[PDB]
Design an enzyme around this catalytic site. Structure first.
Site, PDB file in Angstrom:
ATOM      1  N   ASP A  43       0.777  -1.264   0.000  1.00 27.42           N
ATOM      2  CA  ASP A  43       0.000   0.000   0.000  1.00 27.42           C
ATOM      3  C   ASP A  43       0.798   1.298   0.000  1.00 27.42           C
ATOM      4  OD1 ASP A  43       0.832   0.116   2.727  1.00 27.42           O
ATOM      5  OD2 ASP A  43      -1.113  -0.396   3.531  1.00 27.42           O
ATOM      6  N   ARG A  45       2.596   2.391   2.715  1.00 25.91           N
ATOM      7  CA  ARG A  45       2.634   2.896   4.109  1.00 25.91           C
ATOM      8  C   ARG A  45       3.460   1.992   5.095  1.00 25.91           C
ATOM      9  NH1 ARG A  45      -1.826   7.158   5.733  1.00 25.91           N
ATOM     10  NH2 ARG A  45      -2.897   7.451   3.735  1.00 25.91           N
TER      11      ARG A  45
HETATM   12  N1  LIG Z   1      -3.807  -2.209  -4.754  1.00 19.38           N
HETATM   13  C1  LIG Z   1      -3.781  -1.010  -5.336  1.00 19.38           C
HETATM   14  O1  LIG Z   1      -4.439  -0.761  -6.328  1.00 19.38           O
HETATM   15  C2  LIG Z   1      -2.952   0.064  -4.736  1.00 19.38           C
HETATM   16  C3  LIG Z   1      -1.754  -0.177  -4.063  1.00 19.38           C
HETATM   17  C4  LIG Z   1      -1.057   0.893  -3.520  1.00 19.38           C
HETATM   18  C5  LIG Z   1      -1.571   2.176  -3.652  1.00 19.38           C
HETATM   19  N2  LIG Z   1      -2.742   2.382  -4.306  1.00 19.38           N
HETATM   20  C6  LIG Z   1      -3.232   3.761  -4.463  1.00 19.38           C
HETATM   21  O2  LIG Z   1      -2.870   4.554  -3.341  1.00 19.38           O
HETATM   22  C7  LIG Z   1      -3.992   5.208  -2.782  1.00 19.38           C
HETATM   23  C8  LIG Z   1      -4.365   4.440  -1.521  1.00 19.38           C
HETATM   24  O3  LIG Z   1      -5.399   5.120  -0.797  1.00 19.38           O
HETATM   25  P1  LIG Z   1      -6.361   4.269   0.194  1.00 19.38           P
HETATM   26  O4  LIG Z   1      -7.089   5.227   1.094  1.00 19.38           O
HETATM   27  O5  LIG Z   1      -7.105   3.255  -0.623  1.00 19.38           O
HETATM   28  O6  LIG Z   1      -5.301   3.399   1.046  1.00 19.38           O
HETATM   29  P2  LIG Z   1      -4.389   3.919   2.289  1.00 19.38           P
HETATM   30  O7  LIG Z   1      -3.312   4.819   1.774  1.00 19.38           O
HETATM   31  O8  LIG Z   1      -5.216   4.323   3.466  1.00 19.38           O
HETATM   32  O9  LIG Z   1      -3.626   2.576   2.752  1.00 19.38           O
HETATM   33  C9  LIG Z   1      -4.383   1.415   3.134  1.00 19.38           C
HETATM   34  C10 LIG Z   1      -5.066   1.442   4.514  1.00 19.38           C
HETATM   35  O10 LIG Z   1      -5.425   0.080   4.853  1.00 19.38           O
HETATM   36  C11 LIG Z   1      -4.721  -0.369   6.017  1.00 19.38           C
HETATM   37  N3  LIG Z   1      -4.335  -1.758   5.705  1.00 19.38           N
HETATM   38  C12 LIG Z   1      -3.298  -2.207   4.973  1.00 19.38           C
HETATM   39  N4  LIG Z   1      -3.335  -3.550   4.847  1.00 19.38           N
HETATM   40  C13 LIG Z   1      -4.425  -3.978   5.509  1.00 19.38           C
HETATM   41  C14 LIG Z   1      -5.063  -5.276   5.775  1.00 19.38           C
HETATM   42  N5  LIG Z   1      -4.511  -6.417   5.296  1.00 19.38           N
HETATM   43  N6  LIG Z   1      -6.195  -5.278   6.513  1.00 19.38           N
HETATM   44  C15 LIG Z   1      -6.747  -4.134   7.003  1.00 19.38           C
HETATM   45  N7  LIG Z   1      -6.222  -2.911   6.798  1.00 19.38           N
HETATM   46  C16 LIG Z   1      -5.089  -2.783   6.070  1.00 19.38           C
HETATM   47  C17 LIG Z   1      -3.612   0.629   6.249  1.00 19.38           C
HETATM   48  O11 LIG Z   1      -3.336   0.668   7.640  1.00 19.38           O
HETATM   49  C18 LIG Z   1      -4.253   1.899   5.717  1.00 19.38           C
HETATM   50  O12 LIG Z   1      -5.137   2.391   6.729  1.00 19.38           O
HETATM   51  C19 LIG Z   1      -5.035   5.181  -3.878  1.00 19.38           C
HETATM   52  O13 LIG Z   1      -4.820   6.312  -4.738  1.00 19.38           O
HETATM   53  C20 LIG Z   1      -4.745   3.890  -4.607  1.00 19.38           C
HETATM   54  O14 LIG Z   1      -5.122   3.890  -5.990  1.00 19.38           O
HETATM   55  C21 LIG Z   1      -3.414   1.362  -4.857  1.00 19.38           C
END
Ligand SMILES: NC(=O)c1ccc[n+]([C@@H]2O[C@H](COP(=O)([O-])OP(=O)(O)OC[C@H]3O[C@@H](n4cnc5c(N)ncnc54)[C@H](O)[C@@H]3O)[C@@H](O)[C@H]2O)c1
Ligand SMILES: NC(=O)c1ccc[n+]([C@@H]2O[C@H](COP(=O)([O-])OP(=O)(O)OC[C@H]3O[C@@H](n4cnc5c(N)ncnc54)[C@H](O)[C@@H]3O)[C@@H](O)[C@H]2O)c1
Ligand SMILES: Cc1cc(C)nc(SCC(=O)Nc2ncc(Cc3cccc4ccc(Br)cc34)s2)n1
Ligand SMILES: Cc1cc(C)nc(SCC(=O)Nc2ncc(Cc3cccc4ccc(Br)cc34)s2)n1
Ligand SMILES: [Zn+2]
Ligand SMILES: [Zn+2]
Lengths: 301, 301
Positions: A43, A45
């Site tokens: 993610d 973070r």
């Molecule tokens: N998979 C993807 O498509 C991907 C990956 C990385 C970033 N992004 C992009 O970055 C941005 C992310 O913003 P957002 O608000 O969706 O995410 P975010 O930045 O809030 O990060 C994810 C959140 O989920 C939590 N988290 C991580 N893994 C978890 C799990 N297994 N179970 C429960 N909670 C968990 C983190 O603590 C955080 O609160 C968007 O613009 C997105 O497109 C997308």
């Protein structure tokens, strides 16, 4: 003087009983990067800044800017190769949403993910609002052309390190993700209004609710509509709102004495969905579905 | 590794010099309730809750709900009478924006105010985005009719305590303000994208940046575009953003060592505008304009 309280208590158990009642017909999911971390997609973070150093950008955020992309597309595509997932197996959480679809409970899945796992899990275009766009399709950037390319074409360009050009006009071809400078997709604006009038339950998974549109989308739900957050940490809370609109302003209220409709289940998204499924009597159906769909993917490797 | 720094320093003086440079051609103002408090229109932060008690609503926020309005319109219209301003004299701050218009510097004024003072001050429909709508016009709520009524008609209904009905079909006629449940105006969505690509300076006045759309609108500006807040207190700041998009996420950064483009001038909006006008060499023009326009209003009483 008081709001209708659709949950009998502010717990996963209260949400489950509400879900099983006649009152709960239309669920909207708001899902973010946290639902795909257990699929091996980080993610950022646990950050991009290191990946970016080698590209010698004017500043790191230039990688997200549409104007910088159009002048210098190579850094984006080189990063896209570094970040490209090595496999695409949707999580228990994605298949929980497929269950909601198949049981007729899913009004919409709004996602901020660009990884296409919702589609792989069997959600169809009509079920989805890809709010930050997606890699699923790409388009020629020339206004008079706009030729569409599928992910298989874009993938091949990314992996061969050939800057994708349109076959009709030789303009750049860009993945349908929302770069800074671009509007959210038309699809988002056409669904949001209607959807958030009809929603009986808002399920928020794997997002900190800090970026748009999700940060404000939670406040568009009817005041009585319950809101469940499944996430590693609490999100969406703010200080009591002091402006004109009172309870309509500000975010989630999990913990005050005025709390009446919001619930936070803290842990892994996959574990939260499995726990909810279990309360609903769906645990075997979900486990069976995951097993067969993951096997179907494993059988093609 | 670093962003272009268009301000030579993070002060009103640095903003003024930037405004006088060739680089600053397009200013967008984001104005809220704070620009009208010196005109005798309270902001409800020095509250509605008391006014609302007498109407015996199911809960206070029902007054803002479009569905409650359509079933029981009388409380809204009774409140509208209580809250109706006794005069409409735009402030120094409104006339500062008229100066920007007349000097060709105003790309757009986005307002969350419904009081019509921008229009009274001489901003025209093409200069304005009334993001929370306005009392300036009202419409019949019947989809097949939509007859438009001017404020003089609505005013008379409000003051005579006659629930406004359409003359063509006898449906309710509602002021063009955005009730909860309603979309932001079409005008907002058609301007925002284009405007925030072209903006050279963002002037934010009289808003805490807590409600939509302004809370997130500040982040749509180009990363190099300076942002000046004129307000009684700081607004728009947040903890450093820890997600993927880095500096593109989160709000105003006035005070960290990374601060490079945002400036907070704390005090009365009227005093801030007069101070900025003075730095620009516009203080006499602004004072003359206010004197003549207020006199023109006083001459019709
Ligand atoms: N998979 C993807 O498509 C991907 C990956 C990385 C970033 N992004 C992009 O970055 C941005 C992310 O913003 P957002 O608000 O969706 O995410 P975010 O930045 O809030 O990060 C994810 C959140 O989920 C939590 N988290 C991580 N893994 C978890 C799990 N297994 N179970 C429960 N909670 C968990 C983190 O603590 C955080 O609160 C968007 O613009 C997105 O497109 C997308
Ligand atoms: N004039 C109006 O049209 C009016 C009046 C009251 C409420 N409202 C509605 O309430 C909401 C207000 O949201 P908002 O974010 O615009 O305002 P807000 O709720 O943030 O309140 C105004 C802000 O301006 C500050 N302020 C007040 N008077 C000031 C002055 N003279 N100089 C400098 N700062 C001052 C306050 O401290 C506060 O930060 C909107 O929905 C709006 O339509 C409108
Ligand atoms: C199908 C597929 C392909 C790829 C490259 N990955 C993914 S998911 C993994 C991942 O994090 N990839 C990513 N690719 C680019 C990322 C960062 C970025 C850069 C420039 C513009 C952007 C505009 C919008 C967004 Br949201 C992210 C943007 S982050 N699935
Ligand atoms: C021309 C004119 C007329 C009136 C009544 N006043 C004003 S400015 C003063 C004032 O605060 N009046 C107000 N009128 C109603 C207010 C509160 C409210 C109730 C229901 C729906 C609403 C939907 C959107 C908004 Br924003 C505010 C709404 S607050 N100028
Ligand atoms: Zn083309
Ligand atoms: Zn009518």
């Amino acid at each position: 003087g008081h709001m209708e309280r659709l949950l009998d208590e502010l717990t996963l158990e209260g949400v489950a009983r509400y879900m099983q009642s006649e009152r709960c017909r239309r669920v909207i999911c708001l899902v973010g990067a946290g639902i795909s971390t257990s699929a091996g997609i980080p993610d950022f973070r646990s950050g991009l800044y290191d990946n970016l150093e080698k590209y010698h950008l004017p500043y790191p955020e230039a990688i997200f800017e549409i104007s910088y992309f159009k002048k210098h597309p190579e850094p984006f595509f080189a990063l896209a190769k570094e970040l490209y997932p090595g496999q695409f197996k949707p999580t228990i959480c994605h298949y929980f949403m497929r269950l909601l679809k198949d049981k007729g409970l899913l009004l919409r899945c709004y996602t901020q993910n660009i990884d296409t796992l919702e589609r792989i899990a069997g959600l169809e275009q009509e079920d989805l609002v890809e709010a930050h766009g997606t890699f699923y399709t790409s388009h020629c950037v020339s206004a008079s052309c706009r030729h569409e390319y599928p992910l298989s074409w874009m993938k091949e360009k990314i992996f061969s390190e050939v800057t994708p050009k349109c076959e009709d006009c030789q303009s750049l071809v860009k993945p349908d993700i929302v770069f800074f400078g671009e509007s959210l997709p038309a699809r988002f604006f056409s669904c949001m209004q209607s959807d958030f009038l009809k929603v009986d339950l808002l399920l928020v998974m794997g997002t900190s609710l800090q970026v748009q549109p999700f940060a404000s989308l939670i406040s568009k739900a009817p005041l009585s509509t319950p809101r469940l957050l499944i996430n590693k940490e609490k999100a969406g809370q703010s200080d009591p709102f002091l402006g004109m609109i009172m309870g309509l302003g500000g975010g989630m209220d999990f913990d005050s004495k005025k709390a009446y409709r919001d619930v936070a289940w803290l842990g892994e998204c996959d574990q939260g969905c499995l726990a909810l499924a279990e309360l609903l009597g769906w645990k075997k159906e979900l486990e069976d579905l995951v097993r067969r769909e993951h096997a179907s993917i494993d059988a093609q490797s």
